[PDB]
Each structure stands twice: as C-alpha cells, then as structure tokens.
C-alpha cells in the first residue's frame, strides 16, 4: 500500500524573511486503481486549509507520487509549532498520520571563529581557511563564504556534531589559491541561525 514521508523546511527559508518556508507531505506507492488521495493538515491540533497539491507524477515503477505542500510562517516554525499531515486512500485500512516540528529545546547562539592557515600550509599551492561554528542549538544552520560581495564556492562544511554540553559544532573549510591569500583579499564566513541577532552573523579573515 501507499506510504507517507513528511519533510521540514530548509533552514535558510525559515531564517530569511525574504524566502518562503513550506512543509511537504509526500505519498509514495499510490496505485493506478485508486490514485485519489485526501490530505488533512493540522497546526498544533488545529486544522488548516491553505495546503496546495503539486501535480501528480507517474513513477518508472507503475506507481504515482502525490505531494501536498503547506506554506508556514517563519515564526510558527521557529516557535516550534507542530505540523501534522493526515493521508487517506482507498487502498489503506486506516489513515496514516505523521508529525514534524523544530527540534525541541532552548536555542543557543553559535559562536563563530575564523582561523587562518597554518604556517605549515604556506608551502602548498592552496590554503585552508577555517570557520569554526560552535555552541549552537538546534542544529538547523547555513554556512556560506564570500569575498568582495561575491560568493566563494570552493568550500566544504562538516555535518553538525553533538557536543558534550548538548549543543552542536561544525567546521567549514574554504580552499583558495595561496596567491589570493597573499594578495590581501578579505574572506567572509556567513552563518545563519535562529539564535543569532537578526538570524545572521559574518566573520572576516585576511593576511595578518
């Protein structure tokens, strides 16, 4: 029979007032014989009605994928409201319910520290600029790098690691040509998190 999967909004979308956060109820294994699916939505037990169904998609394995999308307010998500999707279909002895929400717990402000390359890396063609982000809760975050207003895309970021005090830490490493580091260019670590002032902080780093 049909199965249900319910996904949160992207961190960025909940954090940027100019973006639109949405939760997504995905129903897989929908039969050709009974493709009609009914969605009910609840925000903290109270039903809402502004969900919209995305176009039906036929899958290579003879089933349909049906997806309902509920737009949410930023602050409802950040305040920790609970979102329930209830799915009904004829080929289903009983309706399936699924609930998701922000991680429970007091939010803690990330501490953001930029770290130049080791004197030992200076021999190499390319150098590592490190952004250490520690002491944040929950683990929902965005880390990006830039220089002179332009995104620097040659970075990688570790997944959040759970620390011994109950918060999370990660590190983000941007690899630049040594010559650009020598050239006095300023690089910036952009961190977005609910518990930061205005959801945003930026830390800069240049040849000392």
């Amino acid at each position: 029979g049909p199965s249900v999967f319910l996904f949160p909004p992207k961190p960025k979308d909940t954090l940027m007032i100019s973006r639109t956060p949405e939760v997504t109820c995905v129903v897989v294994d929908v039969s050709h014989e009974d493709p009609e699916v009914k969605f009910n939505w609840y925000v903290d037990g109270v039903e809402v009605h502004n969900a919209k169904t995305k176009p039906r998609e036929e899958q290579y394995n003879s089933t349909y994928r049906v997806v309902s999308v509920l737009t949410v307010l930023h602050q409802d998500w950040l305040n920790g409201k609970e979102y329930k999707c209830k799915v009904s279909n004829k080929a289903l002895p009983a309706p399936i319910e699924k609930t998701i929400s922000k991680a429970k717990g007091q939010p803690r402000e990330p501490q953001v520290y930029t770290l130049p390359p080791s004197r030992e890396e200076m021999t190499k063609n390319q150098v590592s600029l490190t952004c250490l982000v520690k002491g944040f809760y929950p683990s929902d975050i965005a880390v990006e790098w830039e220089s002179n207003g332009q995104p620097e895309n040659n970075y990688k970021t570790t997944p959040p690691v759970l620390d011994s005090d109950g918060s999370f830490f990660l590190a983000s490493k941007l690899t630049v040509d040594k010559s650009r580091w020598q050239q006095g260019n300023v690089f910036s670590c952009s961190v977005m998190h609910e518990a930061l002032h205005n959801h945003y902080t930026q830390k800069s780093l240049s040849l000392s």
Binding site: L15, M16, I17, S18, E144, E146, G149, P151, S190, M192, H197, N198, H199, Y200
Partner: peptide, 13 residues
C-alpha cells in the same frame, strides 16, 4: 537594524 546576505534581506528586529 537589518541583516542582509548577498543583497537579499535576512531579518530585522
């Protein structure tokens, strides 16, 4: 005061 990110508005208190 307001925070911006690559031109796009982040948040204002």
């Amino acid at each position: 005061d307001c925070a911006w990110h690559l031109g796009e508005l982040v948040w204002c208190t």
